[PDB]
Every structure is written in structure tokens, then in C-alpha cells.
Amino acid sequence: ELVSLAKLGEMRTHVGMVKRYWNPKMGFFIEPERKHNNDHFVLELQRQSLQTAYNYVKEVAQNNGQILFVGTKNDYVKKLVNNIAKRVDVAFITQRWLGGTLTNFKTLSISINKLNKLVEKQAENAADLTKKENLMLSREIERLEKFFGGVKSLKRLPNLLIVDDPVYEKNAVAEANILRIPVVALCNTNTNPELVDFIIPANNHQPQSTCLLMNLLADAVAEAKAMPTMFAYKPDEEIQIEIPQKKQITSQRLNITRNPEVLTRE
Amino acid sequence: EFEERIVKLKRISKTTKGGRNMRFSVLVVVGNRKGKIGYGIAKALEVPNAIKKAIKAAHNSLHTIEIHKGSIYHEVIGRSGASRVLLKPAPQGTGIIAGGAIRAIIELAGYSDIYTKNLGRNTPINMIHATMDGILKQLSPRRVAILRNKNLNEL
Amino acid sequence: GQKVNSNGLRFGINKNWISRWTANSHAQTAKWLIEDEKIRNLFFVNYRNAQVSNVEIERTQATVDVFVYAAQPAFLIGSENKNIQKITKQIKQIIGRTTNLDLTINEIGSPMLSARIIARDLANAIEARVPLRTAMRQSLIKVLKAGANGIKVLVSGRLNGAEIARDKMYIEGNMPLSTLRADIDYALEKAQTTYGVIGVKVWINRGMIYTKGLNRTPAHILHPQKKQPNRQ
RNA sequence: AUUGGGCGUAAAGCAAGCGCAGGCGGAUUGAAAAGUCUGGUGUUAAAGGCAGCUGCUUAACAGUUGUAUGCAUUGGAAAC
RNA sequence: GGCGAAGGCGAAAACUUAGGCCAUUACUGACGCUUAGGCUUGAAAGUGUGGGGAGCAAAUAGGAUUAGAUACCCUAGUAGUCCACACCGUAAACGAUAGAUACUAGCUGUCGGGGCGAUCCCCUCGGUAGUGAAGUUAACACAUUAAGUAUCUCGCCUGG
RNA sequence: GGUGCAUGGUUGUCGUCAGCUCGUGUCGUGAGAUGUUGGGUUAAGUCCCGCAACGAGCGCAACCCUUAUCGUUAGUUACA
RNA sequence: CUGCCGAUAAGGUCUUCAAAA
Ligand SMILES: [Mg+2]
Ligand SMILES: [Mg+2]
Ligand SMILES: [Mg+2]
Ligand SMILES: [Mg+2]
Ligand SMILES: [Mg+2]
Ligand SMILES: [Mg+2]
Ligand SMILES: [Mg+2]
Ligand SMILES: [Mg+2]
Ligand SMILES: [Mg+2]
Ligand SMILES: [Mg+2]
Ligand SMILES: [Mg+2]
Ligand SMILES: [Mg+2]
Ligand SMILES: [Mg+2]
Ligand SMILES: [Mg+2]
Ligand SMILES: [Mg+2]
Ligand SMILES: [Mg+2]
Ligand SMILES: [Mg+2]
Ligand SMILES: [Mg+2]
Ligand SMILES: [Mg+2]
Ligand SMILES: [Mg+2]
């Protein structure tokens, strides 16, 4: 099968956020509450939702669709998406999601075309570049690469979106919804289920659960593309992953003191 | 053959540090006279550019319309702000007894016989909003069959 | 605010002089200066259906040389060189029989991207009761298709016979007016309408001159051939 | 604005309370039948109203046949 | 933050006295909601009679400021502000939101009763606040204490 | 000769101040908002970051002239 | 760190238009 239920439990993919932070519309995936203070999930629903999303992304990638991965959250997730990009040639946006990356694709298409033309000009080289002008063009290459280095490949609107957090990527999910493009996401108890299509009940704060699930969707794409899998359809010894540095791991949401009353009074 | 007809051409203006920036706003209704109709409002410094942008916006948002015997199936009240537009089924022959913005929408949608009365405001955008809202809330006599488990409208 | 004449700001740096002569004395510097204006005005006022873009004058102690560029030189040439003799007599009366003339028509290339004939065509359209919005747009689109940079057209006057004067501009692209290295060609014309006078100003951008020099090189006459004759 | 409107900021919630008459009002059973529904009969003058036809050269018009609304009485229905 | 229907209520004590919340294996058995007319209460100013008068201060006098100052500032200063008994019955008397009844996500506080028993904290039943989606609105905004989905009753509105 | 309150053309002024807008997109029933506002740096909307905005045009800056050092060409009518 | 500080005759333009290229 795809994964093992014990493995999900040991990776902490059945633990959401503090009960104070939850959208009441997400009650279907959170089994009746109890003394847990991080809102646990139904493991059967997790596997069922994951399998459905796996099947769909595989169908798209087999039929030569273009999927775009968008994670602009914690640093770890950024490096994760870059690693997934290395494994599979999927377009990615690790930096901030530009307004209208999909709905006003023409202007960003002009920008990425300019990036490619500048890249080949620099590669073709000339002694006219000298020192000052060469540095200016190189610095321009760096900026359009930092913000378009993963979008350069595609030439047409993607056929699918994978979002790490629908709450943080509200702009990305809104663009996908207005253009009627499938979007999958790892909801974490604080998301509106209406916006997402293939919901995948999961965590989003643990640097282990995220990586396991993110690689799993990447694993579907790699099998459809005919390159060997990484985490899917795999035994215990090869799924093992480590907890990043910098008793048990603490998925508690705190830092509430950084939310005072909006400045008022007179 | 998506025909288009201006329903209003207002003259909006803002104030700057000396003078008045004046821009024309157009309200175009586009319809194929077969079941597809949309509306688009745009602003520009000149009427031609405003019309082009309004038609582009109107063609971007096209809704689907169903007709029954050329008319509207059941009487409906479309609400949008303070504008309330009443639509009523009509026998084949009366023609479109509508007038103004509502009349333009009904003709561009395809409907023939239709009874209308504007019970609220006379602002073209809200009347069109109300008309489209009334037509979009309509229930076919086949959707309720799947819902109520009847016999494809049969008594 | 007020702007310095675009042509006049670029004279003696990147643009040559339309008249190149050195007179003998301060009395002969005035005669030789009004006379060439008459010749240029003659070419421009009448003989307009030819699209004359620029007329240059070259004079020595006593020998007058005229270089006339046009888009349609058939009207100047006439039927088997008829109208041509007429204009020669015109030129001779203005300067004098005692001198030697060497008039030279020279057909022009890339007629579109020239602010003179565009202004003349604009002025003709306004005088012909053509709607102003449509007239500028057709001229703008044809000029851009000709393969040039941005064009700026300002048409101020008693617009459409109105009693309150207005002004309509239409820039479409980079028109760097503050830049000296740019090649901006400027011309102004007076459309004589039944309700008054219409002023049309055309700014055209024809690239960047990256070769230093007070021109001495043609400008938008090179692309196609440029010859014909009537000289000696 | 019964059908067919409103009362925070546009006209309009009495300063608040105790409150008779009036209006409205929990659930179940029985009877009566005042409301309610329905059948029969009488009547609601004629002209006009709407439909058809005739006659004026067609019409306007005239005539012609059809065409309701309510009330009373009597015989049933029992859900509110 | 608490109480009262509203106006209002804050040194301490005694007497008299009103309503309210929670749990009820008890009792009566629709006796309930609203309310034209009627009655009761109703901030401050004001009135009538008799006391009281420390402070303050309408009216008034003077000194300033000012083109002028019958005003803002300052020094004086009567009625009044206080008590008892009689009236007046008006306020931005405002939550600018009549009362009653049933239903409709959630989160954070705080107060009272009850359950457990160091507090703290958990649950239940209510009062008082903030944030907030469906829903409503012309918009601001309201949003389980509705301006939401509905019913009953009363009062009121119809351009300046 | 009249009408600069019918105009063309030219000019003063804010002001050589750093501004004024447009295309596409998004929000708002709408006028409209966004970009152009936040944080740093400048003479500057100059630039860099942030950012439902992404870009572009005019202005700003540089390219033009002149003064300040030196090299090269030339040496009279300069110098000598 | 609270000086002082009052007034401004009447009526008026300006958007012509998208039919369209
Ligand atoms: Mg100002
Ligand atoms: Mg009303
Ligand atoms: Mg009021
Ligand atoms: Mg009240
Ligand atoms: Mg009141
Ligand atoms: Mg009571
Ligand atoms: Mg009673
Ligand atoms: Mg009768
Ligand atoms: Mg008759
Ligand atoms: Mg008092
Ligand atoms: Mg006095
Ligand atoms: Mg005193
Ligand atoms: Mg007194
Ligand atoms: Mg009152
Ligand atoms: Mg609120
Ligand atoms: Mg009146
Ligand atoms: Mg003037
Ligand atoms: Mg911003
Ligand atoms: Mg910015
Ligand atoms: Mg003073």
C-alpha cells in the first residue's frame, strides 16, 4: 500500500493545532474531541484523502500536465521544494507568490521571457560587457532568477497546484479557484475547506510530517514520469527521516502576547 | 454572433490638485440570443477604449441561461441592493413587455414572452444585477425531480 | 510648462543646418537669408500633394543649389517634365537671373517616419472634416507599422469647431525629450479650418544616434534608393 | 404598501413601569357546526361588461344568444 | 466590575422592604404575551411655605483684553445648589435599537449559583463584554445580548 | 480698428519642485482603491528591500557645452 | 504653553458622440 498507519502516527501527521485556532467547518476530519489539546485526526480519512490526491496527480503527470509547487513559508519548506524540484522537473515558486501569477499570466510571461533572453545573452558573452555593465546584468539575472528561477520552464498556465498551507497561500488558492484550476493542500484545522478541492487532512507545523507528505505527492509524479520512488510503496527502513535541528516534539501554538487590541481610545 | 448594446454611458470624474479628471464609463450587455449573456462595466479616458474593455470584461464573465417555451418558467423576484425586479411567465405572443435595462438583458438572453416590473430603484447596474440574480436562482423542473425523487416533472 | 523647441535644442550637436552658406557682408547676409525662406515656403505652401519632407539650400558667392526631398516626386516632375520648368522660373524670379541654379529633387526613403508629411497629412484630414479621433489613430497605427519608435501628436485648437479650445495628445512609447543623443524629428503645421486654426505638433523618435558627429549622414532616406535628378 | 413599505446612523420605538377592555395564545379526547369548503333551489330588474353572430357600402352604431357578483334557505364534510 | 424597569445607586451602623440567579422525585393545571384609555415612578433647572447656608456660582459691580466686549481671564457677589412638606413632568431621559417567544458556526475574557476539592484550572446553568462566518444592510456596520430566519401585540412615520 | 473670454504660435508662474498617468490584473453594488502607500538611501517617484500587485511612459539622473591637471598634433600674426 | 487674530458684491463656461474602422 501507499503508507502504514503506524508510520503516520509516528511522524505526527495526526496532530493539528491548538483547539483555540480551528475553523468550525473542518469538523468532518477531526473525530470527536477529548483531552488532547492539539486536535487529532482520523487516520483512515488521512489515507483515503491522500490516496485520492495521489491518483489525480498521477493522472495529470501521466497525461503530460504541468503541475506547480508553491511553498513560501518556513525555510525548511523552501529547501524541501527545491529538493523536490531537483528530483522532478516540476515548476516551483519558493519565494513570495506574485499577485496574479496565474490570472495575469501574460505579464509574468513577458518577465520570464526577458529572463531567458538575458541568460542566453550573458552565456553567449561579449567583451562589451566590461566590468560595471557585466555586474549590473549579472545582478539582474540574480533577481529574476530568485523570483522566476522555477517558473522559467513552463510556457502556459499550469494544470494543477500543490499548496503547503492554504491559509498562508490564500492568494495562490484564490487565483486557482477563480481560474478553475485544481489545487491540493495540507490543511491544518484552520483552513476553509471550500477553497481546496482534494483536501489532505494533515499537519503543517512539523518539519517531519510536511516532508513525508510533500515527498509522497512528489512520489506519485516521479512514478508517472518513470523515475524511481522515494517514500511511496516503501518499507520501514527506507521511510525513516530525521528531525531538523535549530522529550517529545512540541507542536504547540503560542506567542499569543503578540496580539494586542488594535490601537484605539480617545 | 454575440451582439452587444450599451445600456448606460455615465460621465464619472475625480478631483485632483487643480482640474477634474473625467473618464467615461460604459455598461455593455453581450448576448448570443441562445442562452449566453454577460455584462461588463469599464472606465477609460475615451469612449472607444472604455467600450473595448467593457466588452472584454463582459465576455470574460458569461453565464448560462435555460429557456422554457421561449419564456421564464416560474415567477421570481431578483434582489440586489434596493432594486427589486419582478419576472413573470408569459404566454407565447405577448412579446417582451419589459423596458430599459431589464428589456435589454431579456432580449440579449434569448427569452421572448416575459412580464416585468421594476419595483425598486432605476439605477441600471442594480436593475441588471437584480435581473441576472432572478434568472440565476431559477429552478428547472428536472433538477427538482432528481432532488424530490419525482418522475421527470410528471404530476 | 513651456518647452524648448526640440529641433532647435539639437542643432549644431547632432543635427546639421538646413541652409549652409557664408555671406560677404551684413547687407548681403539679410538678402540671402529672407530669399531662402521664400523658396522653402514656396515648396511647402503650394505643391503640397507631393509630400515634400524637407528642402535644403546651398549657396556660394554666386551659385545656388537646391536639394528637395519628396515622397511622391511625380507631381513635381509632371507630364513629360512640364511642371518642372514652371518651378524653375519661380525659383529664378525669387533669387535673380544673374545667378546659377542647380535645383535637385531627390526621392526620399521611409516617408512615414517623418514629422513633416505626417503633420501635413494630419492637417489635411482635419481640414477635410474628418473626425479628429479617427484621423490621429489611423496615422498613429500606420507610422508604428512603418517600423519606428514612439510618436507624440498634440493637436490643440478650436477642436471640432467648439467654442472652447482644447488639446488632445497621444503618446505611444518612449519619447525621451530630455535626451540629446536621441533622434527626434519635429514639425508643426497650421490646419486652416472654417472655424479657425488648428495647431498640430508631431514628435517622432527614430532611434539613437550612437555615432558621434554633426550628422553629415542622411536621415531616413537611405533604406530604399534615393536618386532621380534635374541637376547638371 | 390587505394583496404591496418602513422606524441604529435618512421621517418614525412613547423616559420607564403596574396594568382593565381588545387582539393573540401549550397538548389530548367528546359534542355541537358560528366561522371554512362543497351540492340543490330562489334571487341579484332591463341597458352597459366580455365572447359569437346579423344588419346597415365595412365601421362607429343597433339588435341578437351566451357570459358573472353577492345574499338567503336547505342537504353534507369536521382538518384549523 | 455589581444591582434596579428607567431616572439612579459608592464613609459606617440599625430597622423596614423590593426584585433577581441555580437545583427541585413537591403543588396548582394555560392561570400566559402585548396593551388604546387609566394609574405609578421619572436627571437637572424652576415654583410655594418654613428652616439652613461652609464652599461654589446664573443675575450684578469692578479690573483686564479688545476696533467694540453686555463674552472667554481675574477680584468680589444675590437667587440657587442642602433639608421637610407640596407642585412642575421636560433631557442626546441614547444601546439614537418596544416587549414576548423558538432556531441559527466558533474563539477569548469577566461575574454569580451548582458539581469536584488548596488556589489556579475543568464542566453545567445564567448576567455582563471583545473578536468573528453563513445571514442582513445603501454603506458604516449588526452578527446567539441581532440590525439574521419567523410569529403575536402596542406605539410611531409619509418631502423641506 | 474691436474681441488673448473664439483661437494658432510664443512666454511668465508654482518649479528644475519631484511629481503626473497608462496597460493587464485584483478588491469594491459605486464613485474609487492597488501599483505610486511601509522600512532604509538620496537633490530626486534615485535606488534597494517589503508588498495583490506585475510592468510601462513623461519627468529625475547620464549622454551636450564650459572651467580645473596631463599626454599627443601644430609653431605664425603666438612664444622666442 | 497658552496676547490678539474680524471680514471677502451678483450670474456664469468646458465635454462634443460612438455610429466604427
Ligand atoms: Mg494646491
Ligand atoms: Mg419607504
Ligand atoms: Mg431620526
Ligand atoms: Mg427606548
Ligand atoms: Mg425618542
Ligand atoms: Mg407585565
Ligand atoms: Mg386581558
Ligand atoms: Mg342585469
Ligand atoms: Mg348596443
Ligand atoms: Mg432638581
Ligand atoms: Mg459691567
Ligand atoms: Mg471668586
Ligand atoms: Mg433663582
Ligand atoms: Mg422627547
Ligand atoms: Mg463587530
Ligand atoms: Mg407640508
Ligand atoms: Mg488666456
Ligand atoms: Mg501595498
Ligand atoms: Mg513599491
Ligand atoms: Mg494684540
PDB file of N, CA and C in Angstrom, chain C residues 14-64:
ATOM      1  N   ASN C  14      23.953  67.213 -32.950  1.00  0.00           N
ATOM      2  CA  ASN C  14      23.648  66.028 -33.738  1.00  0.00           C
ATOM      3  C   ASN C  14      22.929  66.326 -35.044  1.00  0.00           C
ATOM      4  N   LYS C  15      22.510  67.566 -35.285  1.00  0.00           N
ATOM      5  CA  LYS C  15      21.702  67.908 -36.447  1.00  0.00           C
ATOM      6  C   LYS C  15      22.388  69.019 -37.230  1.00  0.00           C
ATOM      7  N   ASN C  16      22.471  68.850 -38.548  1.00  0.00           N
ATOM      8  CA  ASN C  16      23.058  69.870 -39.401  1.00  0.00           C
ATOM      9  C   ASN C  16      22.040  70.960 -39.726  1.00  0.00           C
ATOM     10  N   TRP C  17      22.533  72.024 -40.353  1.00  0.00           N
ATOM     11  CA  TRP C  17      21.725  73.189 -40.675  1.00  0.00           C
ATOM     12  C   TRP C  17      21.077  73.016 -42.040  1.00  0.00           C
ATOM     13  N   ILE C  18      19.833  73.483 -42.164  1.00  0.00           N
ATOM     14  CA  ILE C  18      19.116  73.295 -43.419  1.00  0.00           C
ATOM     15  C   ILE C  18      19.683  74.192 -44.514  1.00  0.00           C
ATOM     16  N   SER C  19      20.307  75.307 -44.141  1.00  0.00           N
ATOM     17  CA  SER C  19      20.963  76.211 -45.078  1.00  0.00           C
ATOM     18  C   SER C  19      22.413  76.402 -44.661  1.00  0.00           C
ATOM     19  N   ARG C  20      23.340  76.146 -45.583  1.00  0.00           N
ATOM     20  CA  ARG C  20      24.775  76.194 -45.297  1.00  0.00           C
ATOM     21  C   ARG C  20      25.435  77.149 -46.287  1.00  0.00           C
ATOM     22  N   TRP C  21      25.651  78.394 -45.869  1.00  0.00           N
ATOM     23  CA  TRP C  21      26.310  79.373 -46.721  1.00  0.00           C
ATOM     24  C   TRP C  21      26.971  80.425 -45.846  1.00  0.00           C
ATOM     25  N   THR C  22      27.972  81.097 -46.408  1.00  0.00           N
ATOM     26  CA  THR C  22      28.630  82.215 -45.745  1.00  0.00           C
ATOM     27  C   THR C  22      28.561  83.435 -46.653  1.00  0.00           C
ATOM     28  N   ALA C  23      27.982  84.518 -46.144  1.00  0.00           N
ATOM     29  CA  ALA C  23      27.739  85.717 -46.929  1.00  0.00           C
ATOM     30  C   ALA C  23      28.954  86.640 -46.890  1.00  0.00           C
ATOM     31  N   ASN C  24      28.925  87.664 -47.747  1.00  0.00           N
ATOM     32  CA  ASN C  24      30.043  88.597 -47.829  1.00  0.00           C
ATOM     33  C   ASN C  24      29.970  89.669 -46.746  1.00  0.00           C
ATOM     34  N   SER C  25      28.842  90.369 -46.638  1.00  0.00           N
ATOM     35  CA  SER C  25      28.727  91.468 -45.689  1.00  0.00           C
ATOM     36  C   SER C  25      27.379  91.402 -44.985  1.00  0.00           C
ATOM     37  N   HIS C  26      27.215  92.272 -43.984  1.00  0.00           N
ATOM     38  CA  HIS C  26      25.985  92.296 -43.203  1.00  0.00           C
ATOM     39  C   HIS C  26      24.783  92.758 -44.019  1.00  0.00           C
ATOM     40  N   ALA C  27      25.012  93.401 -45.165  1.00  0.00           N
ATOM     41  CA  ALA C  27      23.916  93.748 -46.063  1.00  0.00           C
ATOM     42  C   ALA C  27      23.529  92.570 -46.945  1.00  0.00           C
ATOM     43  N   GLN C  28      24.516  91.793 -47.389  1.00  0.00           N
ATOM     44  CA  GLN C  28      24.262  90.615 -48.201  1.00  0.00           C
ATOM     45  C   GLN C  28      23.887  89.399 -47.366  1.00  0.00           C
ATOM     46  N   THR C  29      24.019  89.482 -46.042  1.00  0.00           N
ATOM     47  CA  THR C  29      23.597  88.403 -45.159  1.00  0.00           C
ATOM     48  C   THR C  29      22.092  88.401 -44.925  1.00  0.00           C
ATOM     49  N   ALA C  30      21.425  89.533 -45.149  1.00  0.00           N
ATOM     50  CA  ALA C  30      19.983  89.638 -44.978  1.00  0.00           C
ATOM     51  C   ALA C  30      19.238  89.247 -46.244  1.00  0.00           C
ATOM     52  N   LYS C  31      19.719  89.687 -47.408  1.00  0.00           N
ATOM     53  CA  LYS C  31      19.072  89.294 -48.653  1.00  0.00           C
ATOM     54  C   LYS C  31      19.141  87.784 -48.833  1.00  0.00           C
ATOM     55  N   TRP C  32      20.326  87.202 -48.636  1.00  0.00           N
ATOM     56  CA  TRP C  32      20.477  85.767 -48.822  1.00  0.00           C
ATOM     57  C   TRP C  32      19.726  84.962 -47.772  1.00  0.00           C
ATOM     58  N   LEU C  33      19.191  85.615 -46.740  1.00  0.00           N
ATOM     59  CA  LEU C  33      18.512  84.934 -45.645  1.00  0.00           C
ATOM     60  C   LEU C  33      16.993  84.945 -45.766  1.00  0.00           C
ATOM     61  N   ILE C  34      16.414  86.027 -46.279  1.00  0.00           N
ATOM     62  CA  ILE C  34      14.971  86.073 -46.491  1.00  0.00           C
ATOM     63  C   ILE C  34      14.596  85.285 -47.736  1.00  0.00           C
ATOM     64  N   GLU C  35      15.445  85.363 -48.760  1.00  0.00           N
ATOM     65  CA  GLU C  35      15.187  84.711 -50.039  1.00  0.00           C
ATOM     66  C   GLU C  35      15.053  83.198 -49.901  1.00  0.00           C
ATOM     67  N   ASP C  36      15.920  82.565 -49.107  1.00  0.00           N
ATOM     68  CA  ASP C  36      15.821  81.117 -48.944  1.00  0.00           C
ATOM     69  C   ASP C  36      14.546  80.725 -48.204  1.00  0.00           C
ATOM     70  N   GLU C  37      14.082  81.568 -47.279  1.00  0.00           N
ATOM     71  CA  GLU C  37      12.803  81.321 -46.614  1.00  0.00           C
ATOM     72  C   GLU C  37      11.649  81.330 -47.608  1.00  0.00           C
ATOM     73  N   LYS C  38      11.663  82.270 -48.556  1.00  0.00           N
ATOM     74  CA  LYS C  38      10.640  82.294 -49.598  1.00  0.00           C
ATOM     75  C   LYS C  38      10.653  80.994 -50.393  1.00  0.00           C
ATOM     76  N   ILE C  39      11.847  80.515 -50.750  1.00  0.00           N
ATOM     77  CA  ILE C  39      11.963  79.295 -51.544  1.00  0.00           C
ATOM     78  C   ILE C  39      11.385  78.116 -50.771  1.00  0.00           C
ATOM     79  N   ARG C  40      11.746  77.997 -49.492  1.00  0.00           N
ATOM     80  CA  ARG C  40      11.245  76.891 -48.683  1.00  0.00           C
ATOM     81  C   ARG C  40       9.738  76.984 -48.523  1.00  0.00           C
ATOM     82  N   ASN C  41       9.237  78.192 -48.254  1.00  0.00           N
ATOM     83  CA  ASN C  41       7.803  78.381 -48.078  1.00  0.00           C
ATOM     84  C   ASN C  41       7.051  78.077 -49.365  1.00  0.00           C
ATOM     85  N   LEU C  42       7.600  78.497 -50.508  1.00  0.00           N
ATOM     86  CA  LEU C  42       7.023  78.158 -51.805  1.00  0.00           C
ATOM     87  C   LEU C  42       6.810  76.654 -51.925  1.00  0.00           C
ATOM     88  N   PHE C  43       7.877  75.882 -51.710  1.00  0.00           N
ATOM     89  CA  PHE C  43       7.787  74.429 -51.811  1.00  0.00           C
ATOM     90  C   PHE C  43       6.702  73.885 -50.890  1.00  0.00           C
ATOM     91  N   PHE C  44       6.632  74.396 -49.660  1.00  0.00           N
ATOM     92  CA  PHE C  44       5.718  73.849 -48.662  1.00  0.00           C
ATOM     93  C   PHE C  44       4.277  74.308 -48.888  1.00  0.00           C
ATOM     94  N   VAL C  45       4.034  75.617 -49.028  1.00  0.00           N
ATOM     95  CA  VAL C  45       2.658  76.107 -49.155  1.00  0.00           C
ATOM     96  C   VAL C  45       1.978  75.474 -50.374  1.00  0.00           C
ATOM     97  N   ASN C  46       2.350  75.866 -51.588  1.00  0.00           N
ATOM     98  CA  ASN C  46       1.857  75.189 -52.779  1.00  0.00           C
ATOM     99  C   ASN C  46       2.622  73.878 -52.986  1.00  0.00           C
ATOM    100  N   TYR C  47       2.310  73.156 -54.066  1.00  0.00           N
ATOM    101  CA  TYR C  47       2.891  71.826 -54.315  1.00  0.00           C
ATOM    102  C   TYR C  47       2.910  70.935 -53.073  1.00  0.00           C
ATOM    103  N   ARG C  48       1.731  70.735 -52.482  1.00  0.00           N
ATOM    104  CA  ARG C  48       1.625  70.013 -51.221  1.00  0.00           C
ATOM    105  C   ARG C  48       1.279  68.551 -51.426  1.00  0.00           C
ATOM    106  N   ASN C  49       0.594  68.225 -52.521  1.00  0.00           N
ATOM    107  CA  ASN C  49       0.182  66.857 -52.802  1.00  0.00           C
ATOM    108  C   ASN C  49       1.370  65.932 -53.052  1.00  0.00           C
ATOM    109  N   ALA C  50       2.596  66.454 -52.968  1.00  0.00           N
ATOM    110  CA  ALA C  50       3.812  65.698 -53.236  1.00  0.00           C
ATOM    111  C   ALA C  50       4.436  65.112 -51.978  1.00  0.00           C
ATOM    112  N   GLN C  51       4.061  65.618 -50.800  1.00  0.00           N
ATOM    113  CA  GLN C  51       4.626  65.191 -49.516  1.00  0.00           C
ATOM    114  C   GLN C  51       6.107  65.561 -49.399  1.00  0.00           C
ATOM    115  N   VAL C  52       6.426  66.812 -49.728  1.00  0.00           N
ATOM    116  CA  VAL C  52       7.792  67.306 -49.577  1.00  0.00           C
ATOM    117  C   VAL C  52       8.140  67.326 -48.094  1.00  0.00           C
ATOM    118  N   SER C  53       9.184  66.586 -47.720  1.00  0.00           N
ATOM    119  CA  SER C  53       9.570  66.441 -46.322  1.00  0.00           C
ATOM    120  C   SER C  53      10.534  67.522 -45.847  1.00  0.00           C
ATOM    121  N   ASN C  54      11.504  67.897 -46.677  1.00  0.00           N
ATOM    122  CA  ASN C  54      12.474  68.918 -46.310  1.00  0.00           C
ATOM    123  C   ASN C  54      13.134  69.445 -47.573  1.00  0.00           C
ATOM    124  N   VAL C  55      13.398  70.748 -47.596  1.00  0.00           N
ATOM    125  CA  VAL C  55      14.067  71.399 -48.715  1.00  0.00           C
ATOM    126  C   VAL C  55      15.304  72.089 -48.162  1.00  0.00           C
ATOM    127  N   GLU C  56      16.468  71.716 -48.685  1.00  0.00           N
ATOM    128  CA  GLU C  56      17.738  72.295 -48.280  1.00  0.00           C
ATOM    129  C   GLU C  56      18.282  73.218 -49.362  1.00  0.00           C
ATOM    130  N   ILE C  57      19.017  74.236 -48.924  1.00  0.00           N
ATOM    131  CA  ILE C  57      19.519  75.298 -49.787  1.00  0.00           C
ATOM    132  C   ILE C  57      21.029  75.390 -49.617  1.00  0.00           C
ATOM    133  N   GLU C  58      21.746  75.492 -50.735  1.00  0.00           N
ATOM    134  CA  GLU C  58      23.199  75.597 -50.713  1.00  0.00           C
ATOM    135  C   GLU C  58      23.639  76.689 -51.674  1.00  0.00           C
ATOM    136  N   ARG C  59      24.299  77.718 -51.141  1.00  0.00           N
ATOM    137  CA  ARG C  59      24.688  78.885 -51.918  1.00  0.00           C
ATOM    138  C   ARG C  59      26.171  79.177 -51.723  1.00  0.00           C
ATOM    139  N   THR C  60      26.808  79.647 -52.792  1.00  0.00           N
ATOM    140  CA  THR C  60      28.189  80.117 -52.812  1.00  0.00           C
ATOM    141  C   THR C  60      28.139  81.588 -53.248  1.00  0.00           C
ATOM    142  N   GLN C  61      29.301  82.175 -53.561  1.00  0.00           N
ATOM    143  CA  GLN C  61      29.351  83.592 -53.915  1.00  0.00           C
ATOM    144  C   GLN C  61      28.330  83.933 -54.998  1.00  0.00           C
ATOM    145  N   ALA C  62      28.309  83.162 -56.090  1.00  0.00           N
ATOM    146  CA  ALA C  62      27.139  83.171 -56.975  1.00  0.00           C
ATOM    147  C   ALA C  62      27.012  81.782 -57.603  1.00  0.00           C
ATOM    148  N   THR C  63      26.322  80.887 -56.893  1.00  0.00           N
ATOM    149  CA  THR C  63      25.768  79.646 -57.428  1.00  0.00           C
ATOM    150  C   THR C  63      24.832  79.055 -56.377  1.00  0.00           C
ATOM    151  N   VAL C  64      23.568  78.849 -56.729  1.00  0.00           N
ATOM    152  CA  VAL C  64      22.548  78.397 -55.790  1.00  0.00           C
ATOM    153  C   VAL C  64      22.203  76.945 -56.089  1.00  0.00           C
TER     154      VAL C  64
END
